[PDB]
């Protein structure tokens, strides 16, 4: 199949600066056009207001990054290129929330633009259920020329590190195609 990254049973905590570095997998991410990023995780119960689940970021460009994040329990998503402009529509007020202190999954899919999807397609699902679809772009890591770092948890944006939290991560899986809603229902 389509699996290009799988990381199991890792965690972010004080001892690792609330971060699991995956930056060695950056070239695999840059190559993707259609993609899925899936995480199954358990946040500590009284979570920070904003915390990153999976991000790609830059040592030189503070505002160029991709993040799947949680904001006041809402599963959210943002990608910004070398001009700092948004790749996707706002997800901060997307309808689906995670339950901290328990197991949850969040799945992001991206489809590059095609004849029938002229601006591409991005979806975020929470616990197998579509939260929001965004048809602004199908931009992804291939569209971020200055990225250097990949991580679960605390995210290095140039000379600052932000969005850390304590997470148990049963798995992070990245695929080289966009799973369908039906696959997200069964494969989560
Ligand atoms: C998904 C999401 O909400 N992303 C926003 C992000 C997060 O809410 C926070 O990081 C969570 O803690 O906040 C961002 O804004 C915070 C930073 O703004 C920077 O200044 C901006 C300024 O506010 C802009 O209006 C201006 O046009 O450009 C400046 C340079 O970036 C500050 O310099 C920085 O210290 C923070 O205050 C973020 O970038 O983190 C915006 C995300 O969209």
Numbering used by the authors: 118 to 305
The authors write:
Streptococcus pneumoniae Neuraminidase A (NanA) is a multi-domain protein anchored to the bacterial surface. Upstream of the catalytic domain of NanA is a domain that conforms to the sialic acid-recognising CBM40 family of the CAZY (carbohydrate-active enzymes) database. This domain has been identified to play a critical role in allowing the bacterium to promote adhesion and invasion of human brain microvascular endothelial cells, and hence may play a key role in promoting bacterial meningitis. Here we describe the crystal structure of the S. pneumoniae NanA CBM40 domain, hereafter named SpCBM.
Crystal structures of SpCBM, complexed with α2,3-sialyllactose (Neu5Ac-α2,3-Gal-β1,4-Glc, from here on referred to as 3’SL) and α2,6-sialyllactose (Neu5Ac-α2,6-Gal-β1,4-Glc, from here on referred to as 6’SL) are also described. For the complexed structures, both 3’SL and 6’SL were co-crystallized with SpCBM. There are no significant conformational changes between the apo SpCBM structure and the complexed structure, and superimposition of the apo and holo structures gives an RMSD of 0.48 Å over all Cα atoms for both 3’SL and 6’SL. In the 3’SL and 6’SL complexes, the protein structures are highly similar, giving an RMSD of 0.06 Å for all of the Cα atoms while the sialic acid moieties of the ligands are completely superimposable. The lactose moieties of the 3’SL and 6’SL, however, point in opposite directions. In 6’SL, glucose O6 interacts with the side chain of Asp180. The carboxylate group of Neu5Ac forms a bidentate interaction with Arg274, a common feature in proteins that bind sialic acid. Other Neu5Ac atoms make additional interactions with SpCBM: O4 interacts with the side chain of Glu195 as does the N5 of the acetamido group; the O10 carbonyl oxygen of the acetamido group interacts with Asn209; the glycerol O8 hydroxyl oxygen interacts with the imidazole nitrogen of Trp280. Phe167 provides a hydrophobic platform supporting the glycerol carbons (C7 to C9) that are ~4 Å away, and also forms part of the hydrophobic pocket accommodating the acetamido methyl group. A striking feature of the protein is a deep, negatively charged cavity adjacent to the sialic acid binding site. This pocket is formed by four residues (Glu195, Gln203, Asn207 and Asn209), and is occupied by a lysine from a symmetry-related molecule.
